[PDB]
Design a protein around this ligand. Structure first.
Ligand SMILES: CC(C)CCC[C@@H](C)[C@H]1CC[C@H]2[C@@H]3CC=C4C[C@@H](OC(=O)CCC(=O)O)CC[C@]4(C)[C@H]3CC[C@]12C
Ligand SMILES: CC(C)CCC[C@@H](C)[C@H]1CC[C@H]2[C@@H]3CC=C4C[C@@H](OC(=O)CCC(=O)O)CC[C@]4(C)[C@H]3CC[C@]12C
Lengths: 553, 553
């Protein structure tokens, strides 16, 4: 193994939440960053892992007596408090995909699979490797297993310095003890440098750590051996008045509640601090981008299959198709108004549903994307393109089945050519609306606010679709040309009626009002090819804007 | 005070989570119910407070050496783990409303207010009495303060038996310690019989219970004084091998892991269990219903104001109004098709918004309602009617402003009489659609499923509203007669055009298709009075069905 002797001196995160903190941890030591809420333990462990930087951070952080560099980040892993795992991917599949993404591409796929399986077996996940990870919504692995998977995500890289952040927070006592035992075995058996910040450790848990460092409102008050806390603190003059837990005594004293803070921090600076101070390729790029794309597509296929194929959504589409095939059951080709209403309702449904359902995919996965992009698992372009391709594959199945039922139940324009034409138009419109939803959900990451914004914009698109109101004011017809629903409706009308020659012959005109009812509603101001071109342009441009918005964050 | 002594013997909850649990708690005893997860602490606490009953519970529970009666429940409280508080009510207002609903009506309102203020001061909430309670969404009081408010809710009845199911779960160490201090003061200063199922207490927290009782897989492992656990267990033969927290050691022994369960259970049954066993007016109804209605209306006014006037909902309504006033800006009266499209769009918007928003009011409060219905705070009829009245008052402001802007930015039928006619029709339609949403959200209690069902049924209503398709199949025309949107659309058409005499004179009509396009659209198959009566009938019947569904649960 490549050992890491991590050190930190005078690290003060002056915003203060950190000041006057020093010490070190040697390889094979199981660290304990204890302290109460707001004492800077999480801040200290984020800073020591390279997450925090800039003028807000002072002091020195040394890795093997050297400044933290890129190779350091390649050799140290950080387990954040928030477990950002894909709910519908099993533990084995999740960590296999992570190993494929973050391990160097020089390693063969079989070698990455073997490493992933070894990591599964080492962390005790082999009993639930085939169990779906799940989340609070869909049942899956337990909290301890979820945190173990989160650690394993940072263990496939094989780091000697593993900096966890509250791994037993919100965990069962037995499960927390088992996880702390696993961390201690990693520090001892694997010879790793494990640094963890346990919120409120238990008794056996406190017995597990080989080295304890606790702060006090941003000031490190005691750094030393795990079992040397009691002796040092009774030497200072602070002793339990009852059978107090060493961890509980340590935390309660951190607040200054004993029998305080200033006298004992001075004592630490005069007795223990001196002791701890004296103790111290273009084709290759294309290939890797495409492999990242493939791995991300395979890992998000389950997410799309449970998101785009939601049973509630499936029932929604089925009910819409049944209502379409019953309301327009064997609809006459000559009934211009009813057929146009059907086409406009199809446009409304398949513009509202895809955009609305897409507007959440980016806000709900933003945390996972940021966590896995800051670690270098994949680039933004590859992740965004894989998301776009998977959603393209999965958001057309429901409209395709809907149209397959409706077109033949309604008795629309017969033949196979107009069925493929209207199916292509409907799928392109669904893709364009979905891209608009993606752009709106990426521009701002508030899921509810983005939902309201896409609702407002598609309400505007529908009201300008050319059906509800035909005599648009001269100062408002401009918006009609930027509405996806308008172009879809015009394409559907052109497929069903063409230039309206046959329907105009049926009407007779080529009454003034009757002619107008079939003149502007059937023969629009946009050609059949111009509408297709603008639909494709919007399909590309909305996703381009979504990618730019992702680049903004 | 009225001292109360719980005396439970052989309390086993088959179909096991409890078996052979024996013990008692006297006034002034701050008993703790310790044990690992699933050992039966919560189940025993619920059963000992009267929550659990039936053949599933076997054994004997005595209150003041007598069987639990209805009068006892008026003297025993129960602080459940789930804090069911209205987020937008301040602590003072929340607990004043709770005191009004809970304390007997013979007490004057000023006396109830004084009792509520005294309870605020006693539990340390006087520093945050004016602070909005909030929840995970809207910021407010802390978790410890939230649990304190729950305890106060269970304390306004003034019970001498407080039964706190996991009150420090999710609480900070200092917050949990302070809450346990408050509970100990309640047990000692107020002479109350306080029993709690502490999950994982700290050292001070463990020191603060006068007596403790442990669960081990449903068996009473040790009952006695809080400070006698260590001595009794070293007498048995179990001693800490390290400095171990008495609570932590107690829980670890309860898990059976110790350097076990069966032999020590036998030892308890041999030594300590024998010791415990040896120690073992219709006008008044109307007045109270109306006072409950008024109090619930005042308590839910803030919820409706921050729910029916959501900034996202307000933005949606404003955007819809602006799009109505722009798309149909200075709309001509003679333009029958565009006017009918505007009316149908109004019907769609104001049948979808309230129906969708109503399917969440009942589920998101259901638990709270149950928590405040089994305890006898109010009856189902009063709560449901207060909810209906508040939603009636608060769900008409947005449609009223929307129509006020649209009617005069679109140039519909001028004058004041048709404006109030269309406003009354729109508000009645909003009420009917909201009642449909309430009925569908009460029939099934899942918010997402209710939303999907209500949107499917409103999709059916809109597709049969008489605008999208006019030549309805003979086997499908029955649905339009049960569609709220259809009746609203017909009423709007009758307001804007009446019998269509003026527009027919404008057209000169009496081609045939052009004449029918207006005759079948403007002149429907339902009269104005018939549509109004059916709208009112549906408004009443949907809420009746919602009340019946609430009665089902
Ligand atoms: C015939 C044309 C006009 C149809 C176009 C749809 C519109 C009528 C708009 C106006 C009211 C809109 C609704 C207003 C408010 C909401 C709440 C909103 O709730 C959320 O933010 C849910 C977030 C989540 O699910 O996580 C979901 C969209 C929805 C139903 C909107 C969906 C689109 C609606 C139905
Ligand atoms: C053309 C006319 C009839 C307008 C109605 C068509 C669409 C605008 C509707 C039909 C189905 C609706 C969906 C039905 C169910 C829901 C679940 C809902 O999720 C919730 O439960 C959110 C709860 C919350 O808002 O807090 C989010 C909106 C959504 C997808 C709805 C969005 C609006 C949709 C697409």
């Amino acid at each position: 193994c490549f050992p890491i002797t991590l050190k930190f001196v005078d690290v003060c995160y002056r915003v203060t939440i950190l000041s006057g903190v020093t010490g070190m941890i040697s390889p094979g030591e199981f660290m304990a960053v204890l302290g109460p809420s707001g004492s800077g333990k999480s801040t200290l462990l984020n800073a020591v892992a390279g997450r925090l930087h800039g003028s807000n951070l002072t002091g020195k952080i040394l890795i093997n007596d050297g400044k933290i560099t890129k190779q350091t980040l390649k050799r140290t892993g950080f387990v954040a408090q928030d477990d950002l795992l894909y709910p519908h991917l099993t533990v084995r599949e999740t960590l296999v995909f992570v190993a494929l993404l973050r391990l160097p591409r020089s390693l063969t796929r079989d070698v990455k699979l073997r490493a992933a399986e070894s990591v599964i077996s080492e962390l005790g996940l082999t009993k639930c490797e085939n169990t779906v990870v799940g989340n609070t919504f869909i049942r899956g692995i337990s909290g301890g297993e979820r945190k173990r998977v989160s650690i394993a995500h940072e263990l496939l890289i094989n780091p000697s310095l593993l900096v966890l952040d509250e791994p037993t927070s919100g965990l069962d006592a037995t499960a927390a003890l088992r996880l702390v035992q696993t961390l201690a075995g990693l520090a001892h058996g694997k010879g790793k440098t494990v640094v963890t910040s346990i919120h409120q450790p238990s008794s056996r848990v406190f017995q597990m750590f080989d080295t304890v460092l606790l702060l006090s409102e941003g000031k490190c008050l005691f750094v030393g051996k795990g079992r040397d806390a009691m002796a040092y603190f009774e030497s200072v003059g602070f002793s339990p008045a009852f059978p107090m837990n060493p961890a509980d005594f340590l935390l309660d004293l951190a607040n200054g509640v004993c029998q305080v803070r200033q006298t004992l921090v001075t004592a630490y600076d005069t007795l223990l601090a001196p002791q701890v101070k004296t103790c111290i390729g273009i084709t290759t790029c294309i290939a890797t981008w495409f492999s990242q794309l493939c791995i991300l597509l395979h890992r998000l296929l389950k997410e799309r299959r449970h998101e785009s194929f939601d049973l509630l959504r499936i029932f929604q589409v089925v009910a819409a198709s049944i209502l379409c095939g019953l309301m327009w059951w064997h609809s006459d080709y000559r009934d211009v108004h009813d057929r146009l209403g059907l086409l406009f309702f199809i446009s409304i449904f398949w513009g509202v549903l895809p955009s609305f359902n897409a507007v959440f995919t980016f806000p709900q996965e933003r945390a996972i994307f940021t966590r896995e992009r800051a670690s270098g698992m994949y680039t933004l372009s590859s992740y965004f393109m894989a998301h776009v391709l998977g959603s393209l594959s999965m958001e057309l199945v429901l409209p395709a089945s809907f149209l397959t039922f409706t077109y033949w139940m309604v008795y629309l324009r017969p033949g196979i050519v107009p069925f493929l034409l209207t199916l292509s138009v409907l799928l392109l419109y669904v893709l364009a609306s979905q891209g608009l939803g993606l752009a709106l959900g990426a521009a701002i990451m508030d899921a509810k606010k983005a939902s309201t914004i896409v609702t407002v914009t598609m309400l505007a698109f529908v009201l300008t679709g050319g059906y509800y109101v035909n005599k648009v004011p001269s100062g408002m017809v401009w918006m009609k040309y930027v509405s996806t629903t308008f172009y879809c409706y015009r394409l559907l009308v052109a497929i069903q009626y063409g230039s309206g020659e046959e329907i105009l012959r049926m009407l007779g005109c080529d009454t003034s009002a009757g002619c107008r009812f079939v003149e502007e509603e059937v023969i629009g101001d946009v050609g059949m090819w111009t509408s297709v071109g603008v639909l494709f342009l919007m399909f590309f441009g909305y996703r381009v804007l979504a990618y730019l918005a992702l680049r903004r964050i």
